[PDB]
Amino acid sequence: VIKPDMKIKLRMEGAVNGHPFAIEGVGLGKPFEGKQSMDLKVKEGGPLPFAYDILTTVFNRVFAKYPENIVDYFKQSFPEGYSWERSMNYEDGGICNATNDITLDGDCYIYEIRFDGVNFPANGPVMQKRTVKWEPSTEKLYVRDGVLKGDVNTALSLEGGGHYRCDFKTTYKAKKVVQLPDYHFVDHHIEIKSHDKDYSNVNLHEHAEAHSGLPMDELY
Amino acid sequence: IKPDMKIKLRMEGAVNGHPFAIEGVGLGKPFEGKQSMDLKVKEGGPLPFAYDILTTVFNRVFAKYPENIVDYFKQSFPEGYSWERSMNYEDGGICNATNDITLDGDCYIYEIRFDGVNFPANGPVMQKRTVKWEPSTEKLYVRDGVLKGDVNTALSLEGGGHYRCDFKTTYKAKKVVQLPDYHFVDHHIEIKSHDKDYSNVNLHEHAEAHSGLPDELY
Amino acid sequence: VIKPDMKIKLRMEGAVNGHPFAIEGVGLGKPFEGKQSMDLKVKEGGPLPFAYDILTTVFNRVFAKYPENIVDYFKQSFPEGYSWERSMNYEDGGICNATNDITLDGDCYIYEIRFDGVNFPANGPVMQKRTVKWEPSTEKLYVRDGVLKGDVNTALSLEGGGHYRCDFKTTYKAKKVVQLPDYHFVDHHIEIKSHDKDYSNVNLHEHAEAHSGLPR
Amino acid sequence: VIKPDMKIKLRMEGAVNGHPFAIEGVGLGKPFEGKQSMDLKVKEGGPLPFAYDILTTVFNRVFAKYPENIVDYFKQSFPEGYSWERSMNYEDGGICNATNDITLDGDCYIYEIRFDGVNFPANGPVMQKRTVKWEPSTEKLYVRDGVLKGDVNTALSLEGGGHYRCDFKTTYKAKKVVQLPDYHFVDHHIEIKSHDKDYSNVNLHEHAEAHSGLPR
C-alpha cells in the first residue's frame, strides 16, 4: 500500500481576512524516511497580501518516520486515506481553520484543502509579511474518542528578531478502523527552500520523525 | 438607509470538513434594531450539526443606537462594511466566519463564508443538543482604526446547563467613518420556526446599543 | 439577615510577578441598592510596582441590586456566607488568580482574600502603570454542577487612548445549600474615586445591578 | 559554582480552590546530567484534597543537560540565581499560578515557592484525584524582551485511560545579566516514584535534556 517513493498533488481553496485565494501543488516524498518536497503555485488571489508561512503546515503525517515501537495511525489508514481538521491560534488573535481530505490514487496522495484565517490585525507580522520561518517543532499526539489528536505550541521567527507564537490543535480522522497509538510525539522541521518575489511559486520541504520522548544511543 | 430595509444573503461553508450552502431573504428596521429572515439550505442538507452555530453569522446595522453613541455601522453606508469573526467554543470547536455587506437600493446583500473545525463527535454541536443562544451583551471598542466586538456568551442545552462560546469580531468600514467610544450592544437572537431538518428556518434578532450602568419617572 | 446598610472589612495577601504585598480595607455599602465604597491601605510591599487597577474587582456580589424575578444566590447564602475563586486572564498573558472567603459578623462582611498574578511583561500597561480605569461591564452568570459561575470579557482603558482586555472566570460557592438562579446578567461599574500618589490609600466604589437582558 | 552533585531544599506555600497548604522538600541532583530527585513532606493542609500531580512541575531548569552549542541561561545565572513565574492552564478551566525564587547557598539550591490554583471543578480529575502521571514533554524556550520564556502543551494521563491537557507558560528571569540563548527545546520526564497513601511523603524524580530539534 505505501511505496518508498510517493507523489503528492493538492489544491487549496481559502481566504484570509475575507480575501479569497487558491493554490495548487505537486510534490514527492518518502513516507518511511519522513521527508517530502513540493512545488506550489498560486492560481487565484495573487499576489497574496499575507505571510505565506501561515499556509505551509497545511500543505500529511504519513510523511513522518515512525519507529516500530509506535503504532502508525497514518500509514494504517491507506488506501482509504484519512482527513484532518486544525485550528491555528496565533498569540495576537489571528486564527486559521484548515481541513484536508487525503485520498490515494495509485502512488499519488491527493489533498483537498480548505483554509480560512480571520482577525489578523493590519499592523501584525502576518498582514505585513514579517515572518522568516517556522521553527522546528515537537507535536504531541494522543487519542480522544476513537480518533487521534495533535497539539503543539510552536512559533514563527520574525524579521527584526523575535518570535510570533501559535497554538496548533489538530484532529486526525481515519476513514477505516485502524489501531490506535499511545501518547507519543512527532518532531517537525518545515522549510521554504525557494520562492519568487511575491511567493506565486514556492518550493516547500518538510522532515518529520515520531518518537516517545526522553529515553538507545548506548554506543552499540 | 430607510426605516424598512431588506436583506438578501448567501452563506457558503463547511463544518468538520463537510460543505454546505444556505440562502436567505429578510427584512428589518435598522433604527429599531429588529430583523427577521427566512433561510433555506441549498447544499449539504440535511445539516449534521446544530443550526444554532450559524445564526449569529446570519449585521450590526440592525441595532438601535442612542443618539449619544456614534453609530459606526449606519455611517459606513452606502459603501458598506465587512466583518470577520472567530467563535471559540469551550470544548475546542472553533468557527471562523466573514461577511461582506453591500447595499443595493433598499436591500442589504451579504456574502458569507463559514468554517468550523474540531467539533467532537459526542459534543452538543454534532449531537444537536443546543436549544438557543441566551441573550448577550457585546462589548465594542476601537483598535487599529477599526471597531472590535468581544462577547463571551452561551447556548442553553437540551438536558440543562450551558455550552460556552467566546466571540471575537472585527468590523471594517469600507469608507472613513467616525469612531465610537467604548460601548455595548445587547442582543437576543431567536429561531422562531423551522422544519424537521432545519432546511427552512425563520430567524429573528433584536439588538440595542447602550453605555452600561448609568428612566427617572420623567 | 442582610440590612439596608452594611459594613465591609477585609485583608488581601498576595503577590504580582513574585513580589508580595498586603492590603487592608474598611468600607460600607447598600446591598439592595447594589452600591458600596471602601477605603484601602497598603500594609506590606509598598510602594506597589504594578497597576492598582488589577486588584480592584477583587476588593462581593451581595452588593448587587437583584430584581424580584431573579433568584439572588448571594443574599440567600448568609449568614453562613460564601466564597469565590477567579482567574483574570489579560490579553498579553498576565494572569491573576484570586479567592475571597466572605463571612458575616453582625452587620459587617469580612473578606479573606488571596491574589496572585504572574507573567505580566515588564513593558506592559500593568507593570508600567498605564491603566486609567475599568470600563463598565456586563457579567454573565449561570449554573454549572450545582454552583454559580460568572464569565465576562471586559477591558481597562489606557492612558493614551485604548483598551487592555481581560477574560474573567469566577466560581461562586455558597457555604450552605441555597436556591440556584437561572441565566442572568450583572452590570458593573467600578471606579477609583480618590487615591494618593503611590496608591497606598485608595477610595474605591462599585455599582452593580442584576438583570435578564433583552427585551427589558 | 556548579558542581557535579548538588542538593535541593525548598518550601512551597499555597492554596487550591481556596484551601491552603504548605510543603517542604529536600533533595539532590546532577545538573550536567539533567537528573534530580527529592523527598517532599506535607506540613500544612493535609491530607491534600487535590491531585498531587498538579504540584510536581513546580517542585529548576539548572537540572537540564545542555549541549555545548546551546547557551545555558540557567547555569549562567548562578551564584546570584534566578526566579521564574508560571501559569498552568488546564483544559477544564482549572488554572495554577506558581513562582519560584531560586538562590544558592554553597552546594544547595534554595527554593521559595508560591502556588495558587483556582476553578478546579468538583467532578474533575484533579479534585477527584484521577491522575496517574505527567507524560514526557518537550518544552519550547525562546527569548522575549530580554528574558527567557518557556511554552509547552503537555498532559496528565488519567486512571481509566485518557489525557487531561495543560498550557504551560513560564518566564525565567536571571538575577544578573547573563547571555541569552537561541530558540531551543528541553525534553522532560517527571515521575513520582514512591508515595504514602495520602501523599504526605512523596519521592519525586525528573530527567531533562536540552536540544535543538530536527536539523535544517
From TrEMBL, chain A:
<keyword id="KW-0479">Metal-binding</keyword>
<keyword id="KW-0157">Chromophore</keyword>
<feature type="modified residue" description="Phenylalanine amide">
    <location>
        <position position="59"/>
    </location>
</feature>
<feature type="binding site">
    <location>
        <position position="205"/>
    </location>
    <ligand>
        <name>Cu(2+) 2</name>
    </ligand>
</feature>
<dbReference type="GO" id="GO:0008218">
    <property type="term" value="P:bioluminescence"/>
</dbReference>
<protein>
    <submittedName>
        <fullName>Fluorescent protein Dronpa</fullName>
    </submittedName>
</protein>
<dbReference type="InterPro" id="IPR011584">
    <property type="entry name" value="GFP-related"/>
</dbReference>
<keyword id="KW-0455">Luminescence</keyword>
<dbReference type="Pfam" id="PF01353">
    <property type="entry name" value="GFP"/>
</dbReference>
<keyword id="KW-0599">Photoprotein</keyword>
<feature type="binding site">
    <location>
        <position position="207"/>
    </location>
    <ligand>
        <name>Cu(2+) 2</name>
    </ligand>
</feature>
<dbReference type="GO" id="GO:0046872">
    <property type="term" value="F:metal ion binding"/>
</dbReference>
<dbReference type="InterPro" id="IPR000786">
    <property type="entry name" value="Green_fluorescent_prot"/>
</dbReference>
<comment type="similarity">
    <text>Belongs to the GFP family.</text>
</comment>
<feature type="binding site">
    <location>
        <position position="195"/>
    </location>
    <ligand>
        <name>Cu(2+) 1</name>
    </ligand>
</feature>
<dbReference type="GO" id="GO:0042802">
    <property type="term" value="F:identical protein binding"/>
</dbReference>
<dbReference type="GO" id="GO:0006091">
    <property type="term" value="P:generation of precursor metabolites and energy"/>
</dbReference>
<dbReference type="InterPro" id="IPR009017">
    <property type="entry name" value="GFP"/>
</dbReference>
